[model samples]
Target chain A: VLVLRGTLEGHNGWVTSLATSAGQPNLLLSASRDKTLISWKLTGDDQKFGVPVRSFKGHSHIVQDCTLTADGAYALSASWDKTLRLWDVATGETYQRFVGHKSDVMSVDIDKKASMIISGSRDKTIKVWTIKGQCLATLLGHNDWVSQVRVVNLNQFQIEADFIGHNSNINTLTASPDGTLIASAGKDGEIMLWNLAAKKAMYTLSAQDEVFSLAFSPNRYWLAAATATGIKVFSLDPQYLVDDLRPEFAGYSKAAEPHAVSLAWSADGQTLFAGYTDNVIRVWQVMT
Target chain B: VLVLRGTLEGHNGWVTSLATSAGQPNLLLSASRDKTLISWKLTGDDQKFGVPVRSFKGHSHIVQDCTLTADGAYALSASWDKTLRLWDVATGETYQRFVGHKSDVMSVDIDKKASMIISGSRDKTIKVWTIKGQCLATLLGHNDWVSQVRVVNLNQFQIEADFIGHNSNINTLTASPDGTLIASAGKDGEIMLWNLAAKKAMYTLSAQDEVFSLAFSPNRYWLAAATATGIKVFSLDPQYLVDDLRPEFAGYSKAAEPHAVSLAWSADGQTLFAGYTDNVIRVWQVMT
Candidate 1:
């Protein structure tokens, strides 16, 4: 069972996106609809404690998503203000601002080497950029808004193909740590897994509700999906270690609707953080 | 000595205002520049735990200040959107919207009876409103932005007089729990204590930096001021138990500049919550 351990409370609006790198397990960064990004120092004293060490404030509108460099030294954030900003994670200063997106930038990601960046925008396009704010390439194919973008392969900077299976907007996309599988989920309540090498949609899982966010464990053995109701964890390698972490209302007499909007995992795979619509981040731990 | 007990993480922007009533000690409400308000449920389990029970969102700009009704059932928030909103704390719904401020509404407070409300705004005017959102009166006297306002006497719905002392903008105004003294401070770094009955500025405390917020403890003996560097606590009754709580940067290798932007005290007088410019709320406990 995944039991609720701690609730991290900082964002005033919906906790829109969360990012963590395995290289720095204790450092976490979050972007919110409140138009700012916060880098947190996780105090592992208890599963529940962390404090904001630095806050990045430059976006004029809601910040939609963020990603950390593999070294955790820098972060890139997408915003509704029609731009993405790279920040010095330690100093809380803007390193560069990429302003090529025509509309609200919804999602962003950096390659493992941290030299290149990719972003999805409401203008229905994804653009590739260097860390120095130069537009390398603008890829356009999605008929509707592009809600997610990621660098699946560092060596190849091109989108090979689009696996068309989602019936609705694709809200989240993640590549398995082992670098072979890609997971994409969204409003249609379906999770599609694609094999990079085979160039085919390999599997699909029924989430039963709108999936807002998804993340893969560091060990590449498990995938977690944050849904409108609660969280569902699926096993990829073993297939037997699946579990559901339900929305909690243990203390409140009448709790508001529980929905997990964002998900992240610790480097050690010992903890999971789920960001909620209620402007809270609930910490979860695996219980024997 | 005061020890850092916990860090409550939830608002992505500066936490501009905080409210906690003695009647509902466990429930805390915070307003932020992120343009939303959150009601927190504090768990006394370890003095470091709290979960956001509800989030109220509607403001189009920064929410500068907030106050709760004495019973804690309702809340009034002022915003840079040029309006004030009344929220039902339990349902997380807006009960009424007071829209008459010409400019950014900076500060707000409700009478102990919960029937009337007063607000300060960047328009250099203070307007009084009924709980039903009626514009009762508009008082004008300040030379610049009216940064703070409060109902010093519920029986009188008018400003009796103005104590001119601060050299710059007045940022904060708080009345003592006993209803006899009113403490006002601002960018001038001078805290003026006005004796309501005497109609005169009784004493002045020289704060070194700009003071953004002031809070009175429930016991009516301590006044806590949030400043540019850190927090200062003063004894009102005995004047002998004064102490300073400095800004913290314990674990980080290079932390950002820390400044306390808002202050609130728990009903039992055992805990003090200081909201910071870095988008964090530090919890402090008095040590014996």
Candidate 2:
């Protein structure tokens, strides 16, 4: 069963992105169109839950997305201001400013060591920058705006195959913590589960609306999708062929039809945070 | 002659306000709707003039206005996010966040010592707050939005009288450095210079369009007006009874008719900074 734990309320605008890292299970970071990023401390107490301990400010436009270092010591935010800012999480200081994108930066992610930064931009290109703000490469592949980018942190394995199943634009991607499986979601309202070991698709799930982000439960074979309708969880186990992994996980009030735009899983796999278009981040806990 | 020194171009949106202080004569801080504040380091070299040395990020909404402490050690930004953020000027850290405003904070000012902050908000209330985020008082009188608020740092004098001349709404106010005179401008496009000691109006100037801000040259009896048309300067000295104080100060390219929304005077009175709605802050250097 899944229970609504609490809500994180600080951003005055839409929560466009959410992030969590393996090293820090209790910490969560969020990016918003209000031009700011907030880091929340997720304690179980409802009265003191999700306290915004640090507020990162410096992007002069909408903060399209953000990601944290593995240790959660720092964060990088991609902005519509055509730049990315690296912030010190503890001090809330913008230590470095990356400035090379010719157009709005749409997404950002950093390597495990926090040594290199990758960003997708409206310029239809992906640019790589050193942590100190030097542009190393400008990659061009997408014919339109490059909306999302990620660094696959596979310790020993390298990707050697390409699988395509989406009819429209692919929007989200996530690799399971075990590095054995991958989940890809598309604007076509389909989520494809791929087993990397076999280099083949294993399962397919249908979301009614566009899926914006997907997250893998750190300990289980369950995957979560942040869809335009709401948040959804599916079991990857073939034994449980039934749909709706957790029926009790409903009650995400979509009165105004707020899309669940972003999702992040805790290191312990017990908590999940979903960022919504209505300017609120709601937390969910799995009952053992 | 007034020459356009150069343009500071980093903000992706409107430059809502500008600030300079006595101790840091060569430093300028600007607030923008882009949701960030930039501190420009002014130098004599044209290639290096007004370099954006520090960019402050934190406010989640339009930074409507900002003010620097006298020493330029700190700055306060009022935002539509309904919060005031105090930043460390040198480290680019958001040291404190003052939260209490019920609606959009349109204007903000701090005392010389930076101990107290006063803000005006769309909630139709003017609030006084401590630097540590405590609400000291909420002054209520206006039936409409409180669009502006200022703290008068008179060493020993207290307000003893009221002078009114604007036909519509008063928008901007500034006091001469010597504390003998005050300049007030209005939405009606009228500027009134009041002799504070004599408790009477001394001079009046007409701006063709609505005036948004006024700044007094620290070393001279000249008042600069940020009007919807452009930047205007009126000589407050009765000896020079002219409509325009400097005819050479007229190269503000208003092709699209961008209003001069904010203005600031350098401590030396040799430099004037005007923030325009076109997302550029133009600097003017007076030729001796």
RMSD of each: 27.3, 23.9
Question: Per-residue lDDT for A200-275 in model 2, tens only?
Answer: 5676778767788877888767788876556777776652421222223356544446677877777777888777
Off by over 4 Å in 2: A1-288, B143-167, B178-180, B239-255
Q: In order, how many clashes per candidate?
A: 7, 3
Each model's C-alpha lDDT?
Answer: 0.73, 0.70
- lDDT agreement of model 1 with the native: 0.73
| Pairs that clash in candidate 2 | A57-B57, A57-B58, A58-B57
Q: Chain A TM-score of each model, in the order shown?
A: 0.88, 0.83
CAPRI quality of model 2: incorrect
lDDT by residue for model 1 (B158-259), tens = 222233334454746777776567787755567776665575556677677788788777764778888765788888667643777885576543435667
What does DockQ come to for candidate 2?
0.01
Fnat for each predicted structure, in order = 0.00, 0.00
